[PDB]
Amino acid sequence: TDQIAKNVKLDDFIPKRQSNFELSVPLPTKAEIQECTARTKSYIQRLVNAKLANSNNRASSRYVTANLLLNNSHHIEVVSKQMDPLLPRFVGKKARKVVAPTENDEVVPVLHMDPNEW
């Protein structure tokens, strides 16, 4: 019958450096900084190249810096065509207002541990 309040513990309430003032929370290593910043630089480079190559500026093509297995059998070559240069390059793109759902995958604890003059 301990299935109630599965996400709340004292290990969130209790400060960890309380028992030990020496408790080392070390800086990340130089190798970890290099790995994480190379990964995020490649990701930001992906998003900059996507948000520049989807522009109508021809001069956005200069500051920018395919085989697909389906279910079991279909080894598929994916060939993006040459679009017509006069047509809308993204005819599916349209101005629209969208309400995105703010889903709750896991219930987040909100932990507040703790008259006449106002």
Partner: protein, 342 residues
């Protein structure tokens, strides 16, 4: 078990720090200083953005003006000088994030895309992007080349007060008025760890410069967070201190905490001990409400401390190199049992 925790606190003792007293008052601005930034290499100067829209570049060793950077039209809220670039990113509430090329002292880049007023910058120190967030409850990351909002960061409810960036994930340690210190995944765009231990608006998060931790400050509770997992390290003492505007963390583990009540409170960052509580004197003609310490920073070395207050003044605080552990021991180490803050 609580009695064991209190006894293990009372077993340990805090570290002594040198007492801070004021050394220099700079009275230049025609408005309130809202954020102070200092160059992370040279220590030749520090720039204080103020409500009279004019950032002023003051001098550490002499206290002189050298230049005035007045490209905004609204109140300059945050100023963040780059570490590996000769830039100066100046969030105001013009809805504009302006880049100041410090080899030219000119505006070069204007980051448009914010939906309301902006409150804070956070230059990611080992990449070429800046983290700007404000009243519109969403952090926009900005590639500094293409001026594009690269990664929106969705999930804070109210206006976002102070954003800090780390070189390793959590690469955006942000905090808002919904009392949440969210740790962000810049790749996934999702909050890895939502820290909901504060009660009111967290106006202040400061990076520890020599360990991977962030101190965050609500009213009368300042809490230190280990960013490796998102764990509480120390709940500071901070009883009846007031509304904390800004924090700043020394290299030598001295934590400033400026209150709206004019009070200062220097904290031993390891132990959570409050040792010194100043009273910032107002100017000779101020109102009593203008004692508040709006913003602060340390020196790169940490031996200085700069505060911009709301009495149109800039005060510099330095340690007593003549006091010892037996001369001025600070306040007493006695954790309080009526509070659960210990």
């Amino acid at each position: 078990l609580i009695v064991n925790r209190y006894e293990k606190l009372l077993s340990q003792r805090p570290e002594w720090h040198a007492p801070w007293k004021l050394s220099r008052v700079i009275n230049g601005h025609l408005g309130w200083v809202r954020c102070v930034a200092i160059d992370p290499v040279d220590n030749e100067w520090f720039i204080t953005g103020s409500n009279d829209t004019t950032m002023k570049v003051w001098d550490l060793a002499t206290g002189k003006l050298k230049t005035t950077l007045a490209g905004h039209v609204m109140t300059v809220r945050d100023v963040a000088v780059s570490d590996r670039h000769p830039y100066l990113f100046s969030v105001s509430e013009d809805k504009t994030v302006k880049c100041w090329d410090l080899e030219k002292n000119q505006i070069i880049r204007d980051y448009y895309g914010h939906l309301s007023g902006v409150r804070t910058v956070s230059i990611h120190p080992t990449l070429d992007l800046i983290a700007t967030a404000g009243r519109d409850s969403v952090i926009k990351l900005w590639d500094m080349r293409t001026r594009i909002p690269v990664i929106t960061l969705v999930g804070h409810k109210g206006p976002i007060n102070q954003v800090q960036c780390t070189p390793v994930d959590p690469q955006v340690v942000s905090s808002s008025t919904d009392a949440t210190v969210r740790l962000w995944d810049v790749v996934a765009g999702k909050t890895m760890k939502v820290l909901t231990h504060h009660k009111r608006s967290v106006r202040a998060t400061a990076l520890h410069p020599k360990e991977f931790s962030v101190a965050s400050a609500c009213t009368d509770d300042i809490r230190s967070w280990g960013l490796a997992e998102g764990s509480l390290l120390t709940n500071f003492e901070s009883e009846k201190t007031g509304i904390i505007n800004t924090l700043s963390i020394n290299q030598d583990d001295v934590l400033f905490a400026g209150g709206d009540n004019g009070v200062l409170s220097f904290y031993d960052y390891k132990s959570g001990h409050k040792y010194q509580s100043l009273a910032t004197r107002e100017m000779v003609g101020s109102l009593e409400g203008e004692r508040s310490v709006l913003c602060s920073t340390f020196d790169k070395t940490g031996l200085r401390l700069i505060t911009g207050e709301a009495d149109k003044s800039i005060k510099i605080w330095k340690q007593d190199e003549t006091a010892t552990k037996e001369s001025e021991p600070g306040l007493a180490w006695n954790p309080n049992l009526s509070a659960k803050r210990f």
